[PDB]
Amino acid sequence: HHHHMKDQYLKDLTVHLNESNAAPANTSMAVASFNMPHEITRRMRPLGVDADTSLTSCPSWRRLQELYEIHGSESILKNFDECKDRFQRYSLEVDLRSSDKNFVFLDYSKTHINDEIKDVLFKLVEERGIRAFMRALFAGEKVNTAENRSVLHIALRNRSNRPIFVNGHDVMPLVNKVLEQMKKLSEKVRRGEWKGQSGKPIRHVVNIGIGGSDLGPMMACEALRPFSDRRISMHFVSNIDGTHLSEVLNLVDLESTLFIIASKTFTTQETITNALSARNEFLKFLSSRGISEAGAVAKHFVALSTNAEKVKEFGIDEENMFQFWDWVGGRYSLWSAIGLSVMISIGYDNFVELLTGAHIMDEHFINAPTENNLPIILALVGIWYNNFFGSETQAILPYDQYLWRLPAYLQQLDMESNGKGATKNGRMVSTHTGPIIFGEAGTNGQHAFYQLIHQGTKLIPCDFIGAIQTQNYIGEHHRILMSNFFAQTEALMIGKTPEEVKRELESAGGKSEDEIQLLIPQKTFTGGRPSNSLLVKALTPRALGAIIAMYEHKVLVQGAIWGINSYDQWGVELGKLLAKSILLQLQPGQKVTNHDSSTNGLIELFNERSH
Amino acid sequence: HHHMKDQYLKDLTVHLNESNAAPANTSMAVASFNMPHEITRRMRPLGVDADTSLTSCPSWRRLQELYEIHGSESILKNFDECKDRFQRYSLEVDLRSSDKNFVFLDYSKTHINDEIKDVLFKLVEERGIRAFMRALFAGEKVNTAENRSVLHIALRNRSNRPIFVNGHDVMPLVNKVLEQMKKLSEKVRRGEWKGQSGKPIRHVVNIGIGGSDLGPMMACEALRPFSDRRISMHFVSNIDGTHLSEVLNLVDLESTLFIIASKTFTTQETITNALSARNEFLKFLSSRGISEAGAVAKHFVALSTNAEKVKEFGIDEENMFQFWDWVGGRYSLWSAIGLSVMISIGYDNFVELLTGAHIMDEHFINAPTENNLPIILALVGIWYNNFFGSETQAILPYDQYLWRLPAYLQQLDMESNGKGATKNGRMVSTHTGPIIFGEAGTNGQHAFYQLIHQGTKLIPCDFIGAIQTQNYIGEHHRILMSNFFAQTEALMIGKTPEEVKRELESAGGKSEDEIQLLIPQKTFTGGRPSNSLLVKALTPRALGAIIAMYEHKVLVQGAIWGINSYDQWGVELGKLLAKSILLQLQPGQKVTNHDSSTNGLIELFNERSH
Ligand SMILES: O=P(O)(O)OC[C@H]1O[C@H](O)[C@H](O)[C@@H](O)[C@@H]1O
Ligand SMILES: O=P(O)(O)OC[C@H]1O[C@H](O)[C@H](O)[C@@H](O)[C@@H]1O
């Protein structure tokens, strides 16, 4: 069989090269495009199932491959030189319908995409039935087939309150009931009516949770600090590393601290262990102060969860349990009860603004025609680079210091959703799926790793994200900030030729002919490196809501095109299972022989030196 | 240009006729053959000939052959075939300390057998790496593009053996500044340094960016258990006015010491932040009825190479802490730039930090290649970067104090080796530095490990941990480290379709159809690599050793690829273009001279900025 596959591989390669439209200098590009699905299916071979051909055999996919072989080595500037108003034709704006005339604007023009490639990318949406999938997901159909679940984070922010049905019942009444419950608690805390066991108003909130129950609340509290009540300090314990709880406990006055235990399952080992430790340390502190423990936990601990039974066991009153539902994915849970810490920080009205921004982006996504659909366009630009240029990564570069946790947040949203190797129809993928997300807030990144983005050997798609207006007016800081935002994307695209560099070196003087000759390529910029520029008028709660929903929907479109399930996360189960067994073996002086020699050796090293 | 196509097809034909790849793996041979062609196509705009000095190395060609033969094997294959693989594929550097600390590397969970390992070591010989190392350590001007020495190792040279630059021993210079740092840090820590109204310093605000920011902040976070909690440390870096504004709101300005950290003292973000901080500080004193006479001299110090600009800012000569051109910014934690660290953790702990790097330096320069920890890290990285073709490198510290280590290594690695041209003026024919990413464990497990386990990219991972915690509570550290060991095991061994099926069938509650569809979605390929790095405890000495180890890994990789790890020309174009655009950011101003995107974006900003 293997010999037959080889003879076939060679036949397919010969045919592909004979039929390719690639320029004579670019034959290697046709080979790379041909070879991509072969290399993916080799790497995924231990899945032990057939390769999915449903995407790669789409007429549009064949056409995109042909267009890549033709255009993939062209500059980006070429398209601008050919169309003087390319910017107007390769950008679009979503109105946020707010009193401050806010918006989300996408400029996707600094890309290797011409009108033909763009038409064919839109045709891929049609051929893969993406618009019908979107309608099914929005209507509550159980599109998370692996877990037989609906996918309805959009219900959480459904301000229209049109019914959305799960198991024959409208979910909106319960969504709105929990929002009202959240409102009442946040109001009591913000107004100083919620008192601790010794009568102190709450001045500290400590969220305990991990992953989806941590990244969102923290990112949003950071992002929306200008809209917050500064009298209430927000803390986020997440690592099981004892350092995390210990350092946060050191920062708070426990008599005025509200603990929020955030866990969809309420069984995650890190979160439940942190919660039990926090409760133990809290009660011990009270006892040391001669303060009665009777009724203290009920005043100082609340829970955000789907599991009432587990919350009860912990000792939290059901009245202080904030419910959400199985159709709320953890990495999509900011909008739900999980956002309670956020609502305490910025207030109910601002939380509703946050929901409303997401809702407006939802309405745009579901209703706008494909050609004018901002999240679909984001998704297609991403696929062009991810699947045809073969870029492994995606940089997220927000030029707003409050947004410094956005890259980490989008890391979970994107990579945990679409880091998949098997399709919903039980096959292995033949195309690349989710990319690796990385990034830091600008301008800091410019002084850390943009060197590589400009001059290295990898093509890195970059999303530059900014606000036209600052919340903190000081000197010329915001103008300087945004001069960098605009300049970096210009620089990535246009580069700097050897001829330009040579002239500059000669004009600077002080160097020999040979010295200049060595130096020229080292100071040359290829250019032709792509970016998207995303702008809002101002980073308000509404704008942040729109931005996050925008990426949720980008991820939806990409997953659906690739044929994978964006909404499960099976890949975390093996590690949890293996860690349970190892934990039992972490005892001083215990010898271990049942694993591979590395795992055995590492555990024994730990067991021999741990004290 | 059809002659190039003809030749390409001939070369590919010959490569396939001679390849020893298994029948099922022809695509792997094609991928290997095609890699330099794709690199040189992508770097074509550099307009110079391709470097073949690396690809022509006999060891490079042999590694290519071994990749085509062994590249699709599981990782477990080599464990099954050698019962003590762990012993042969691990090593430890002794940190010579009273607490018996160490740096231990386990590189066994890799696609590397004895034959590949030997050939990787031969590559070190063939690229003259050991000789390069000696030249660099000796102060030779190996940063050829800038005609500079590269001597961050002199900064922590506790032995005080002479090291010469322009025929002069730099060690007396290094030691004088350390003593200067000692004196200031002691005055601050002892409450002797008073502000303009007589208050002891309780807040330190470092203003700096990149190399003048990431190291100091990373180290102050990493070494918090060894710090003076009476002194709050703050790090302003972004020009975004939010950064300075929020920090100013957290401090009492009457007891704040500002530290302006900038090698050039001309970086736009840092000098603008420093001028604004100076302004707000003086407005604050005035609002409190406090005299401004001599106030800047009392509250501002500088870490720099530029004495004139420091003088111009108003800082006294006694409070300028010098370092030197041969200290790269991303290698500068060990110099005057580390002043905020020394204030926070004290002179003695800062000396421990230097000592740890020094011991790693001694190991690096003296240990044989086969037992050289940074060289092995570099070689493992090159195997994946250049032969498997992985674009990234994950850095996963299982220590909450190390939460800024990935961002710090992002600069160290990517700004060093994110290069496309060689020192001899050619374009590279091989991939250079990978993209660094990561978050402290266990948090990353609940964020993005899903993709590391089940996605379509191979991602080399460095797992870094401490055997002992500084914060004993309950069973937290045992739980933390059970995850540390389990994740690397999981990545390697995966979970077969038969295992998955058995589990699903025992659990029940699903139709046959549901189970059939679910099995592939819950299968793990395994064969995904990792390094496990351990220290006994994350002390200042251990941190020093860890950073020095990565500095030297970067040195070795850069030297093998023939690039300059120590310059950074790639940041210049953006700075020039931003100064130009800044001139055009005025309300209502129309802009026509750029590309239509840059024009439109700027006009959008100018139309709606008010
Ligand atoms: O210390 P400075 O001279 O202010 O430079 C700070 C940083 O700015 C530059 O842009 C470089 O990217 C970094 O290598 C450097 O560390
Ligand atoms: O909210 P929890 O049930 O505690 O789960 C928190 C997190 O842990 C899991 O391992 C997943 O990786 C995440 O999808 C999830 O958000």
Q: Per residue, what are the HEC states of A277-339?
A: HHHHHHHHHHHHCCCCCCCHHHHHEEEEECCHHHHHHHCCCHHHEEECCCCCCHHHCCCCHHH
In a shared domain, residues B294 and B276: yes
Name the method of structure determination. Answer: X-ray
Ligand 2 pocket check for B451: Cβ under 6 Å: no
Chain A residues touching B519 at Cβ < 8 A: 426
DSSP A467: E
A491 contacts A455 by C-beta, under 8 angstroms: no
B467 contacts A605 by C-beta, under 8 angstroms: yes
Ligand 2 pocket check for A480: Cβ under 6 Å: no
A416 is catalytic: yes
Residue A226 CB neighbours (<10 A): 18
| Strand (E) or helix (H) holding A95 | strand A91-95
Interface test with B, best of A56, A574, A586, A590 (most B CBs within 10 A): A574
Tokens of A548: 């996050």
Residue B489 to chain A, least CA–CA distance (Å): 6
In 3D space, the residue among A173, A414, A212 whose CA is nearest the CA of residue A333 turns out to be: A212
Sheet holding A531-538, edge to edge: A91-95, A103-107, A531-538, A462-469, A393-398, A436-438
CA–CA dist B86, B296 (Å, integer): 58
Report how far ligand 1's centroid is from the alpha carbon of B241 (Å). Answer: 19
Contact between chains at A498 and B48 (C-beta distance less than 8 A): yes
Contact between chains at A487 and B243 (C-beta distance less than 8 A): no
A380 contacts A122 by C-beta, under 8 angstroms: yes
- The one-letter amino acid code at B510 reads K
In a shared domain, residues A112 and A260: yes
CA–CA dist B287, B276 (Å, integer): 16
CA–CA dist B356, B349 (Å, integer): 11
Contact between chains at B2 and A24 (C-beta distance less than 8 A): yes
A257 contacts A202 by C-beta, under 8 angstroms: yes
Q: Three-class SS of residue A583?
A: helix
Chain A residues touching B243 at Cβ < 8 A: 401
Report how far ligand 1's centroid is from the alpha carbon of A447 (Å). Answer: 6
| Closest residue of chain B to A211, computed from CA coordinates | B446
CA–CA dist A279, A300 (Å, integer): 9
Contact between chains at A601 and B86 (C-beta distance less than 8 A): yes
Residue B578 CB neighbours (<10 A): 23
| Torsion angle defined by CA atoms of residues A463, B436, B381 and A527, in that order, rounded to the nearest 10 degrees | 40
In a shared domain, residues A364 and A252: no
C-alpha pair distances (Å), A449 with each of A87, B151, B570? 28, 22, 10
| Strand (E) or helix (H) holding B601 | helix B596-608
Residue A451 Cα: closest atom of ligand 1: 12
Report how far ligand 2's centroid is from the alpha carbon of B445 (Å). Answer: 9
In a shared domain, residues A274 and A138: yes
| Strand (E) or helix (H) holding A569 | none
Domain that holds residue B260: 1-345
A447 is catalytic: yes
What are the E-state strand segments in B228-380? Answer: 232-236, 256-261, 300-304, 320-322
In a shared domain, residues A333 and A323: yes
Contact between chains at B43 and A524 (C-beta distance less than 8 A): no
Residue A330 to chain B, least CA–CA distance (Å): 10
CA A315 to chain centre: 34
From the list B407, B521, B597, the residue facing A565 with the nearest CB is B521
- Which residue's CA is the nearest one to ligand 1's atom 7? B210
Report helix angle A348-367 to A130-138, nearest 10.
140
A183 is catalytic: no
A404 contacts A222 by C-beta, under 8 angstroms: yes
Q: Three-class SS of residue A216?
A: helix
Question: Which resolution in angstroms does this entry have?
Answer: 1.8
In a shared domain, residues B363 and B484: yes
- Judged on CB neighbours under 10 Å (0-12, 13-18, 19+), B534 is buried
In a shared domain, residues A425 and A563: yes
> Given A326, A346, A366, which residue is the final one in a domain?
A346
Interface test with B, best of A331, A459, A462, A522 (most B CBs within 10 A): A522
CA–CA dist B345, A563 (Å, integer): 53
In 3D space, the residue among A60, A83, A48 whose CA is nearest the CA of residue A388 turns out to be: A60
Contact between chains at A483 and B582 (C-beta distance less than 8 A): yes
CA–CA dist A96, A356 (Å, integer): 9
C-alpha pair distances (Å), A4 with each of A320, A496, B304? 65, 49, 67
Phi, psi of A73 (to 5 degrees): -105, 5
Q: Three-class SS of residue A392?
A: coil
From the list A26, A29, A575, the residue facing B486 with the nearest CB is A575
Sheet holding B203-207, edge to edge: B232-236, B203-207, B256-261, B300-304, B320-322
Can you say whether residue A108 is alpha, beta or left, with left for phi > 0 and alpha for psi between -120 and 50 degrees? alpha
List all residues 6 or more positions away from B262 whose beta carbon is below 8 Å from its beta carbon. Answer: B208, B212, B270, B271, B302, B303, B304, B306
| Closest residue of chain A to B106, computed from CA coordinates | A598
- The one-letter amino acid code at B155 reads L
Contact between chains at B38 and A28 (C-beta distance less than 8 A): yes
B301 contacts B274 by C-beta, under 8 angstroms: no
Residue B84 CB neighbours (<10 A): 11
Tokens 């603004």 correspond to A353
Q: Which ligand is nearest to the CA of A324?
A: 2
- The one-letter amino acid code at A185 reads L
Interface test with B, best of A36, A80, A243, A459 (most B CBs within 10 A): A243
In 3D space, the residue among B335, B353, B318, B293 whose CA is nearest the CA of residue B208 turns out to be: B335
A292 contacts A197 by C-beta, under 8 angstroms: yes
Residue B188 to chain A, least CA–CA distance (Å): 23
Give the number of beta-carbon pairs within 8 Å between A and B: 617
Q: What angle do CA B202, B206, B211 make, to 5 degrees?
A: 150
Chain A residues touching B44 at Cβ < 8 A: 73, 526
A200 contacts A317 by C-beta, under 8 angstroms: no
Q: Which ligand is nearest to the CA of B208?
A: 1
CA–CA dist A4, A10 (Å, integer): 10
CA–CA dist A457, A451 (Å, integer): 11
- Judged on CB neighbours under 10 Å (0-12, 13-18, 19+), A611 is exposed
End-to-end CA distance of chain B: 55
SS (H, E, C) A540-567: CHHHHHHHHHHHHHHHHHHHHHHCCCCC
A484 contacts A444 by C-beta, under 8 angstroms: no
In a shared domain, residues A276 and A365: no
| Strand (E) or helix (H) holding B558 | helix B540-561
CA–CA dist B564, B557 (Å, integer): 10
Tokens of B311: 């003088």
Q: Three-class SS of residue B50?
A: strand
Contact between chains at A239 and B525 (C-beta distance less than 8 A): no
What are the E-state strand segments in B306-363? Answer: 320-322
In 3D space, the residue among A458, A441, A536 whose CA is nearest the CA of residue A492 turns out to be: A458
Q: Three-class SS of residue B34?
A: helix
In a shared domain, residues B371 and B317: no
DSSP A437: E
List all residues 6 or more positions away from B407 whose beta carbon is below 8 Å from its beta carbon. Answer: A440, A448, B214, B218
B180 contacts B321 by C-beta, under 8 angstroms: yes
User: A258-272 b/e with 16+ CB inside 10 Å = b?
Assistant: bbbbbbbebebbbbb
Residue B161 to chain A, least CA–CA distance (Å): 32
CA–CA dist A329, A308 (Å, integer): 18
Residue A213 Cα: closest atom of ligand 2: 1
Ligand 2 pocket check for A271: Cβ under 6 Å: yes
Show which residues of B are catalytic: 415, 446, 575
Contact between chains at B30 and A31 (C-beta distance less than 8 A): yes
Q: What angle do CA B403, B405, B410 make, to 5 degrees?
A: 130
Q: Three-class SS of residue A400?
A: coil
Number of structural domains found in chain A: 2
Name B465's bridge partners.
B534
End-to-end CA distance of chain A: 56
A578 contacts A441 by C-beta, under 8 angstroms: no
Q: Which ligand is nearest to the CA of A333?
A: 2
> Given B345, B373, B391, which residue is the final one in a domain?
B345
Name A260's bridge partners.
A207, A302
Contact between chains at B450 and A32 (C-beta distance less than 8 A): no
Query: Between β-strands A169-170 and A165-166, what pairing exists: parallel, antiparallel or unpaired?
Result: antiparallel
Report how far ligand 1's centroid is from the alpha carbon of B494 (Å). Answer: 43
In a shared domain, residues B414 and B285: no
Report how far ligand 1's centroid is from the alpha carbon of B572 (Å). Answer: 11
| Strand (E) or helix (H) holding B38 | helix B26-42
In a shared domain, residues A499 and A591: yes
Report how far ligand 1's centroid is from the alpha carbon of A535 (Å). Answer: 27
In 3D space, the residue among B27, B33, B17, B28 whose CA is nearest the CA of residue B111 turns out to be: B28
DSSP character string of B169-213: ESHHHHHHHHHHHHHHHHHHHTT--B-TTSPBP-EEEEE--GGGT
A282 contacts A252 by C-beta, under 8 angstroms: no
CA A76 to chain centre: 27
Q: Three-class SS of residue A236?
A: strand
| Torsion angle defined by CA atoms of residues B299, B305, B308 and B314, in that order, rounded to the nearest 10 degrees | 0
> Given A324, A346, A368, which residue is the final one in a domain?
A346
| CA dihedral over B445, B450, B454, B455, signed as positive or negative | negative
Name B205's bridge partners.
B234, B258
C-alpha pair distances (Å), B133 with each of B151, B168, B416, B556? 11, 20, 16, 8
Tokens of B46: 């550099």
Ligand 2 pocket check for A211: Cβ under 6 Å: yes
CA–CA dist A520, A512 (Å, integer): 12
DSSP character string of B350-401: HHHHHHHHHHHHHHHHHS-GGG-HHHHHHHHHHIIIIII---EEEEEES-GG
In a shared domain, residues B238 and B95: yes
Chain B residues touching A42 at Cβ < 8 A: 24-25, 27-28, 72
B66 contacts B116 by C-beta, under 8 angstroms: yes
CA–CA dist B113, B96 (Å, integer): 31
